[PDB]
Amino acid sequence: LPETHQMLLQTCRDFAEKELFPIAAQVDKEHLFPAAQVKKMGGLGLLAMDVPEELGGAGLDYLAYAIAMEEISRGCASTGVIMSVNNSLYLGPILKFGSKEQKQAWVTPFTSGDKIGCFALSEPGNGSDAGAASTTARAEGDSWVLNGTKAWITNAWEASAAVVFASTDSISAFLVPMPTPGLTLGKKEDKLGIRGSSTANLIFEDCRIPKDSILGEPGMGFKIAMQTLDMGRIGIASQALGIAQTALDCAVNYAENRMAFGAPLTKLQVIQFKLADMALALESARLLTWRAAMLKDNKKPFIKEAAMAKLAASEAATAISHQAIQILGGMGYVTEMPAERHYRDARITEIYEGTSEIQRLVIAGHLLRSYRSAENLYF
Amino acid sequence: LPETHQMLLQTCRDFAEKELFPIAAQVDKEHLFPAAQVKKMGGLGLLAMDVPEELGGAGLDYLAYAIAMEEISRGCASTGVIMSVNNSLYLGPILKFGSKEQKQAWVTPFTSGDKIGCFALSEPGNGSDAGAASTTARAEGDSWVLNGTKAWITNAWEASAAVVFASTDKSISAFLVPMPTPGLTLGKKEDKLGIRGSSTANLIFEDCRIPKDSILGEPGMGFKIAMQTLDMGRIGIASQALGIAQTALDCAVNYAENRMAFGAPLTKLQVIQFKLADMALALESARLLTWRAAMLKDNKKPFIKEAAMAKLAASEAATAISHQAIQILGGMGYVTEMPAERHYRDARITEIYEGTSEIQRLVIAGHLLRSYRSA
Amino acid sequence: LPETHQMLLQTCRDFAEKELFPIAAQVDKEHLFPAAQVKKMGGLGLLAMDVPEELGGAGLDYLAYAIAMEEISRGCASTGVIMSVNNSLYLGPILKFGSKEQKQAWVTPFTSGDKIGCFALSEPGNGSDAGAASTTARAEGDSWVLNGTKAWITNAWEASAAVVFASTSISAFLVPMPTPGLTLGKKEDKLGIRGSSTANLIFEDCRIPKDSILGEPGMGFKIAMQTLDMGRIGIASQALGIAQTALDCAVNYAENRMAFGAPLTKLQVIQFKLADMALALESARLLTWRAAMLKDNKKPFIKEAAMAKLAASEAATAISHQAIQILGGMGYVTEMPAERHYRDARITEIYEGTSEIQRLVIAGHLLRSYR
Amino acid sequence: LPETHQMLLQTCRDFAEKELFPIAAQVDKEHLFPAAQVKKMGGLGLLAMDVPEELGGAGLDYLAYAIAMEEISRGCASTGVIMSVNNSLYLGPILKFGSKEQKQAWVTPFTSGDKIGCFALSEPGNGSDAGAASTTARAEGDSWVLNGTKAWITNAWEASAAVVFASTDRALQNKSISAFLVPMPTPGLTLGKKEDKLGIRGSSTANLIFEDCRIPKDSILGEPGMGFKIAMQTLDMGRIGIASQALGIAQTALDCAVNYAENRMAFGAPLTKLQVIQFKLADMALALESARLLTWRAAMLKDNKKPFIKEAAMAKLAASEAATAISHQAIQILGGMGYVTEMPAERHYRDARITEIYEGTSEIQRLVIAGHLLRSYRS
Numbered sequence A: 001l002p003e004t005h006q007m008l009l010q011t012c013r014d015f016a017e018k019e020l021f022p023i024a025a026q027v028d029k030e031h032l033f034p035a036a037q038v039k040k041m042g043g044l045g046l047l048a049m050d051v052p053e054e055l056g057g058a059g060l061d062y063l064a065y066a067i068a069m070e071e072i073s074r075g076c077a078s079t080g081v082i083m084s085v086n087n088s089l090y091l092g093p094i095l096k097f098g099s100k101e102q103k104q105a106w107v108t109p110f111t112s113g114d115k116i117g118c119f120a121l122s123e124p125g126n127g128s129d130a131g132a133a134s135t136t137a138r139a140e141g142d143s144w145v146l147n148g149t150k151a152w153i154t155n156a157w158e159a160s161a162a163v164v165f166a167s168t169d170s171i172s173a174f175l176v177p178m179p180t181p182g183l184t185l186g187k188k189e190d191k192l193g194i195r196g197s198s199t200a201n202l203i204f205e206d207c208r209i210p211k212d213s214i215l216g217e218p219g220m221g222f223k224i225a226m227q228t229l230d231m232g233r234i235g236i237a238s239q240a241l242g243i244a245q246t247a248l249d250c251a252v253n254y255a256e257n258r259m260a261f262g263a264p265l266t267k268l269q270v271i272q273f274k275l276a277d278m279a280l281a282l283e284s285a286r287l288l289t290w291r292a293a294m295l296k297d298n299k300k301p302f303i304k305e306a307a308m309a310k311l312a313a314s315e316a317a318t319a320i321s322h323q324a325i326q327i328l329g330g331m332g333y334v335t336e337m338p339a340e341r342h343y344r345d346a347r348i349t350e351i352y353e354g355t356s357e358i359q360r361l362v363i364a365g366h367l368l369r370s371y372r373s374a375e376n377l378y379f
Numbered sequence B: 001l002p003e004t005h006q007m008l009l010q011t012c013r014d015f016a017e018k019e020l021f022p023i024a025a026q027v028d029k030e031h032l033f034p035a036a037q038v039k040k041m042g043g044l045g046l047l048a049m050d051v052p053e054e055l056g057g058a059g060l061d062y063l064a065y066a067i068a069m070e071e072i073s074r075g076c077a078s079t080g081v082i083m084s085v086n087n088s089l090y091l092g093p094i095l096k097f098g099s100k101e102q103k104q105a106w107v108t109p110f111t112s113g114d115k116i117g118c119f120a121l122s123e124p125g126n127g128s129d130a131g132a133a134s135t136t137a138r139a140e141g142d143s144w145v146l147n148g149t150k151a152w153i154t155n156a157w158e159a160s161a162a163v164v165f166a167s168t169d170k171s172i173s174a175f176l177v178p179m180p181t182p183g184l185t186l187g188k189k190e191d192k193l194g195i196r197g198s199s200t201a202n203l204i205f206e207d208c209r210i211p212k213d214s215i216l217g218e219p220g221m222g223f224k225i226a227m228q229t230l231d232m233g234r235i236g237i238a239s240q241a242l243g244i245a246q247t248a249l250d251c252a253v254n255y256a257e258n259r260m261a262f263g264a265p266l267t268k269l270q271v272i273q274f275k276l277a278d279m280a281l282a283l284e285s286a287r288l289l290t291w292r293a294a295m296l297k298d299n300k301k302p303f304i305k306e307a308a309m310a311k312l313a314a315s316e317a318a319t320a321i322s323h324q325a326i327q328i329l330g331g332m333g334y335v336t337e338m339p340a341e342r343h344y345r346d347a348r349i350t351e352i353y354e355g356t357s358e359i360q361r362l363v364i365a366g367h368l369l370r371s372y373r374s375a
Numbered sequence C: 001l002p003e004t005h006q007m008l009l010q011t012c013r014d015f016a017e018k019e020l021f022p023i024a025a026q027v028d029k030e031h032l033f034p035a036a037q038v039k040k041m042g043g044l045g046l047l048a049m050d051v052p053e054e055l056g057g058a059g060l061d062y063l064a065y066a067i068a069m070e071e072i073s074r075g076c077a078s079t080g081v082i083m084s085v086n087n088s089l090y091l092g093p094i095l096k097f098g099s100k101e102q103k104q105a106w107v108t109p110f111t112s113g114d115k116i117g118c119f120a121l122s123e124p125g126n127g128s129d130a131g132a133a134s135t136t137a138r139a140e141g142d143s144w145v146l147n148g149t150k151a152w153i154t155n156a157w158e159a160s161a162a163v164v165f166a167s168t169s170i171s172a173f174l175v176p177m178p179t180p181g182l183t184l185g186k187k188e189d190k191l192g193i194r195g196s197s198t199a200n201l202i203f204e205d206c207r208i209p210k211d212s213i214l215g216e217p218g219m220g221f222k223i224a225m226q227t228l229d230m231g232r233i234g235i236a237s238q239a240l241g242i243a244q245t246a247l248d249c250a251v252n253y254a255e256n257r258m259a260f261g262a263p264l265t266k267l268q269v270i271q272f273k274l275a276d277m278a279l280a281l282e283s284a285r286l287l288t289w290r291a292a293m294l295k296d297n298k299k300p301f302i303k304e305a306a307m308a309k310l311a312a313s314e315a316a317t318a319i320s321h322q323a324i325q326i327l328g329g330m331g332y333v334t335e336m337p338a339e340r341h342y343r344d345a346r347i348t349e350i351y352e353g354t355s356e357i358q359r360l361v362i363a364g365h366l367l368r369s370y371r
Numbered sequence D: 001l002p003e004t005h006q007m008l009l010q011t012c013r014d015f016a017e018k019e020l021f022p023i024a025a026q027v028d029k030e031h032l033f034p035a036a037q038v039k040k041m042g043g044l045g046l047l048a049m050d051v052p053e054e055l056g057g058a059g060l061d062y063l064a065y066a067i068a069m070e071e072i073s074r075g076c077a078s079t080g081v082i083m084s085v086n087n088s089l090y091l092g093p094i095l096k097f098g099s100k101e102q103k104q105a106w107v108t109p110f111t112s113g114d115k116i117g118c119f120a121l122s123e124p125g126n127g128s129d130a131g132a133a134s135t136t137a138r139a140e141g142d143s144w145v146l147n148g149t150k151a152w153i154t155n156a157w158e159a160s161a162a163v164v165f166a167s168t169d170r171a172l173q174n175k176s177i178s179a180f181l182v183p184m185p186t187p188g189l190t191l192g193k194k195e196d197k198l199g200i201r202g203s204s205t206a207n208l209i210f211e212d213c214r215i216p217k218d219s220i221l222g223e224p225g226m227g228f229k230i231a232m233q234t235l236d237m238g239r240i241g242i243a244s245q246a247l248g249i250a251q252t253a254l255d256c257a258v259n260y261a262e263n264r265m266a267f268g269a270p271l272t273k274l275q276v277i278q279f280k281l282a283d284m285a286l287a288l289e290s291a292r293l294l295t296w297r298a299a300m301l302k303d304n305k306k307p308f309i310k311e312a313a314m315a316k317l318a319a320s321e322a323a324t325a326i327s328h329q330a331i332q333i334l335g336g337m338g339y340v341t342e343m344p345a346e347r348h349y350r351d352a353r354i355t356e357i358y359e360g361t362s363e364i365q366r367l368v369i370a371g372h373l374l375r376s377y378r379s
């Protein structure tokens, strides 16, 4: 790693050990939003890593973001997803597709932890099938009028703004303030894990927003959504790496100190093998993530690469966390140790920002297009 | 299946649907012992299936037990482990190794739902390493004196008797201990990932005196009793794992038939079809292993390797099936509105208790090789 | 297991150890059809097991067949597939769908190892897509006229008769071999099961009598599908034999190979590999026997046959792989039988319906059970 | 990738396409050592990639070697192992541990494809247990006398020199082995019969039998008792070569399956229109790209003079298991055509299998990884 990125890593790891490890159990048990910690992170630049310093951000790159995301998620996975949604899914598309004015109004006040945003694509009847949005935007006067329900929205209860995708005929993106007349929140979902982040429906009933609330041009929405998810996928890959790293750390320390049949568990061959496979899966997932980050930072294509990273990391996080429980034994099954929380948090990384199935379809599609292109050059 | 085992399956299915399915979510949410339902199961003979009627049991066999155990656990996994501990781990060793008088005293009042037992082998410093028991039993006058802590005892807070293993020096012995009794305190209930309706806690013995006739079998038989008990228990846990797997698969199939994506049900996607075929294969395979082990036990044939195979297969299937059930549900899989996330949490214990998967592999390997050496 | 089935197991084991184990390497190395051993098997009844003794069969059941199949295949995988093709794919449909006269003409002469048969469904352009058959049968007078090429036909170069599927919409036909209008393609050069022959059947204006049709016109696809259900139990069992011999090999070796001061079997890792192998095999055998018993009791067994074949074939590949790994360097050379088991195992995931087709068949039945 | 490494990649691909692809079926079928092709590779620097130009080498690095190895092995797996043995196992130790005079005598004439070497560590009695060498070397006057059988020596029947490991001191149990440079032929050395192998059949494998074999005193590479260390550090490098070989086998297997799947029809469409086929292909691509990044990390650590034992073991482990899984799935996608020699898939499956065994089995790799993982946590 570069020197800068090494220092960043140490700052983030110190933060995580100081501020996140001591609350992780509480945040999870009580489904508690980590308010004070998100705000401190805001001051550190972690909620706006890839945002130009001129717009109020850290002025860093996606590799730095990937590194920071891992270290944060290692401390608290919920804190990780909150940070990832703000960077990749909220601020991301606004920097990419927004006017100078939209950036001033909707980026800058959301860079410091005073306000955060959210991303609303999924609906109760469709999440993988993104283009099947039934939520409608209709132009009427100096306004777009929004009607429908978005589902599963991370940060719904804490967000001051949302990038919302609505059918205009055919999908468009809109900047929506929160709260706003004609927008109500559903009840907070009761989740298996990442319990400190809020997840709730967004309910639009003749919600009016000004005409310049549209992000990009009408019909650009599906493309805005897909490109934003490419970036988001790197963030989720990093979160999954943090979850996996901390689960592995937990297994190693335990197994070194737990005695069985006369010696530490780490004298048993089978334990060494579990641990070696855990380390291989994690390091492999990490390199795929950094590849995808560096490609994005060099303005090269990264769709296949982000899908691979998210896929590899999420499945490693679930495998590794399972094996951490197994190595701990009975201690793995109770809330006295952190391993059972790891297994619970890990499990969402295979679902959100495109299920594993979707990721494979994306990779396959890009694989097959690349070979078809190479074939055509002959003709 | 025999006509009689078909009628049992239906009785159990009908009972789980009426009595367990409606309470499963609350039991899990509140960590709440299903006391009324256990008493009802007691009355149906389900807490003493392989006990002779003359001792107040159902007079059935281990095949019937595995079937009933699967149907119960399909309904509620916690009720499952509670039924299994009483049947296999508590009542089982007393039927196998007890005197006639011991069976009348310690089996018969635990055959009907009013009293249940527990099994206490594991300790804080040792669970897989069973023979490392540092709980001590010392002969003093008219009593055995017990000192030490047992850990992870399922049914600790509701149990009226325990089979406790303690070092007396072939250095371990098995003891019938009443609960409550002077010198015994319970630890705090464990806060578990799943099977939250079952209680789990430490048994703490300080100068705990029990009569000399409390010993089960002869002194030094303890390790053997424990190991042969776990063999029977493992068929019970395999059957619980099957029930968790079956209900997770039922959940995924009903959901996928009704959820639309890209114009049609999820079950029209080839990928989803493949998930469900793998799930069905793993489950049916595990069930046959389980039934093989039960039938061997029933015909008074060895079944150590076969019970370990069943427990290993079933339990790893439960975890794989329940994971895939969540995946098929999508977002709905990650929330308590659906039961998928509960099956995932419940399935996970089955790879740990009554011998970890690693312990299972070592047992299977040991018996494999003996079979080649005797050929 | 019944005592009758217990005795059959020992006869087949005895036979395999005397007649098959000593030639397995040669059969494989030289791609050599094991003609003398197949004749002896014919004399024992192994090539006509589920056939009534009135038609010269053994008069046994599919459970007996699956046991015998596993013992033969443990001895030599090519002898196993030759025997399975004759029992399940040739004689099977003729028994189930043929007339009295058809049985006497086409079964009775093929029950004793003098004459064996074959089953021709696949074509160069379609194997999984079995209904896509482009070979044609036209009715010209008191004959059928066949035109087209069938592909991958096991026993092609040794068979005296074939059950051939032709588009008429598909029908089944008994074709004698040799016959005017029929020629054989070159033998395939295979990764494994090299002692069985595999080749194309090429029909050019091939004329056969009108009474050659098996069942009614249009029944062909159903006859083919019901045949492959039976065949799948056979391949399951072939696969169990390969797997079993691979595991026998590994255990003997590991007990007697020293490393770091003890046998390999003293290493915890080797014990785990062995435990997983035994678990995969034993579970696959139970699925396989469930399918054979459902068939013997006239119960549906499509899904169960599919599960048995899928489980058994995937176990044969995983176990043979681990057999090579336990042997180390010795696993990679022809001095040991492990590399041959790896090569033989691999076909069982492909023929009689690929693993992917098995999963589709299983899923279809599963969903219908819930409807 | 640097422009230089991009040129090299194209050179090796072109060579492979021009010289290796057309001989691979024959080399495999007939167990034929591809001597003309190895000589040409020699002229291009491929047999001495990390050797300085001043000793007659290509003057490049291990990243270049890894890239070159993958392209060579894609064309012919046997040519790949022949090249890897010469680079990593023969030349490697001489460059790392040899004197100036040893480099001139034993490196320089083995850099051009006229003479290649071999590496003799394993014995009939022991491979994984490398330290149990019973072949002996006794100091007799001004000479060393060797007695014993080495087993499994790649290039045995074509080599003009060997790096040979022999027991020189059974009293000092951790300084027990020494390394020796031995010419081929030499009085006292005879070869065993060539092994009949599942795959990589163009390479020779056979026993080296020493009986009263006297070699001069300056034949010892490094100090007496250093042999086990020289051998282990040599295998660390070799593992990067073998990982690259395995990538090449996996890549050609994947190329094969994709071409077939796009062009084979079933149920009225190409196989690639089936989801399950797309899934098979996505998993293949992910396993390969992941293994490649692990390999490049290890090569890069070596080239930067950093520790790479764990990383080399991870790479060899990931690549070798990917090659076997990918080649297995290539056969499955071809269906019947996958089982016959008319297509190359069955050969890729046979070649891939060796990569899980030699230069330290998969089991040894996991023990190595676990050991270094644990040491990191302790430090």
Ligand SMILES: Cc1cc2nc3c(=O)[nH]c(=O)nc-3n(C[C@H](O)[C@H](O)[C@H](O)COP(=O)(O)OP(=O)(O)OC[C@H]3O[C@@H](n4cnc5c(N)ncnc54)[C@H](O)[C@@H]3O)c2cc1C
Residues within 6 Å of the ligand: A085, A119, A120, A121, A122, A125, A126, A127, A128, A129, A151, A152, A153, A154, A155, A191, A199, A348, A351, A352, A353, A354, A355, A356, A357, A358, B259, B261, B262, B266, B269, B271, B272, B327, B328, B329, B330, B331, B332, B334
């Ligand atoms: C805690 C949580 C937080 C979330 N955060 C956000 C957020 O902030 N903003 C937002 O917009 N959304 C968010 N999501 C939505 C999330 O991305 C979706 O749940 C996910 O995309 C899957 O969509 P779905 O739940 O509708 O499942 P479905 O689309 O019904 O999928 C069900 C199953 O079918 C599979 N499937 C679907 N299509 C195909 C296909 N073509 N081929 C093969 N298989 C297929 C899926 O992979 C899955 O296994 C969140 C969800 C959760 C649970």
Ligand SMILES: Cc1cc2nc3c(=O)[nH]c(=O)nc-3n(C[C@H](O)[C@H](O)[C@H](O)COP(=O)(O)OP(=O)(O)OC[C@H]3O[C@@H](n4cnc5c(N)ncnc54)[C@H](O)[C@@H]3O)c2cc1C
Residues within 6 Å of the ligand: A258, A260, A261, A265, A268, A270, A271, A326, A327, A328, A329, A330, A331, A333, B085, B119, B120, B121, B122, B123, B124, B125, B126, B127, B128, B129, B151, B152, B153, B154, B155, B192, B200, B349, B352, B353, B354, B355, B356, B357, B358, B359
């Ligand atoms: C909810 C719950 C209920 C339980 N019910 C009961 C009960 O009613 N009564 C009772 O006595 N106990 C009970 N158990 C205890 C249970 O059986 C043990 O947790 C289990 O045997 C593992 O023992 P351990 O927790 O001490 O883990 P450990 O023995 O510390 O093992 C930790 C890891 O090391 C591995 N390991 C251990 N030894 C070896 C070895 N030799 N080779 C390879 N790997 C090894 C294990 O497989 C595991 O992966 C229960 C546990 C729980 C969590």
Ligand SMILES: Cc1cc2nc3c(=O)[nH]c(=O)nc-3n(C[C@H](O)[C@H](O)[C@H](O)COP(=O)(O)OP(=O)(O)OC[C@H]3O[C@@H](n4cnc5c(N)ncnc54)[C@H](O)[C@@H]3O)c2cc1C
Residues within 6 Å of the ligand: C085, C119, C120, C121, C122, C123, C124, C125, C126, C127, C128, C129, C151, C152, C153, C154, C155, C190, C198, C347, C350, C351, C352, C353, C354, C355, C356, C357, D264, D265, D266, D267, D271, D274, D276, D277, D332, D333, D334, D335, D336, D337, D339
């Ligand atoms: C040695 C050998 C012996 C054989 N014996 C006989 C014999 O005696 N008689 C006979 O008639 N045939 C025989 N077969 C043919 C064998 O059954 C076929 O190879 C098998 O059906 C696969 O068909 P295919 O080769 O045409 O491959 P394809 O049908 O082209 O399939 C290629 C790949 O696509 C997959 N695929 C195809 N359709 C689907 C789908 N809908 N969904 C998902 N995946 C799909 C396949 O599973 C496979 O993975 C033999 C083959 C061999 C190699």
Ligand SMILES: Cc1cc2nc3c(=O)[nH]c(=O)nc-3n(C[C@H](O)[C@H](O)[C@H](O)COP(=O)(O)OP(=O)(O)OC[C@H]3O[C@@H](n4cnc5c(N)ncnc54)[C@H](O)[C@@H]3O)c2cc1C
Residues within 6 Å of the ligand: C257, C259, C260, C264, C267, C269, C270, C325, C326, C327, C328, C329, C330, C332, D085, D119, D120, D121, D122, D123, D125, D126, D127, D128, D129, D151, D152, D153, D154, D155, D197, D205, D354, D357, D358, D359, D360, D361, D362, D363, D364
């Ligand atoms: C074609 C070929 C080429 C080769 N090239 C060379 C060469 O050029 N020079 C050379 O010196 N050698 C060479 N080798 C030797 C190769 O590196 C060995 O085959 C390998 O190290 C395994 O050694 P073994 O065959 O003695 O197997 P064994 O050591 O007998 O092992 C057999 C099984 O036990 C396992 N095992 C052994 N020890 C342990 C342990 N402690 N824990 C867990 N599992 C263990 C192994 O993983 C393996 O699965 C070659 C081998 C082959 C087949």
Ligand SMILES: CC(C)(COP(=O)(O)OP(=O)(O)OC[C@H]1O[C@@H](n2cnc3c(N)ncnc32)[C@H](O)[C@@H]1OP(=O)(O)O)[C@@H](O)C(=O)NCCC(=O)NCCSS
Residues within 6 Å of the ligand: C121, C122, C127, C128, C129, C130, C131, C221, C222, C225, C226, C228, C229, C302, C351, C352, C353, C354, C357, C360, C361
């Ligand atoms: C052949 C194939 C494509 C079947 O799917 P498809 O072509 O769609 O055929 P189906 O959907 O079953 O429909 C055709 C009829 O065959 C019938 N059928 C299918 N399998 C049957 C079986 N096992 N028994 C009886 N009937 C069967 C179906 O019931 C169906 O009847 P209807 O038209 O009344 O609905 C595939 O699923 C399969 O099993 N292929 C076999 C591949 C194989 O084994 N190849 C190697 C053979 S030689 S080694």
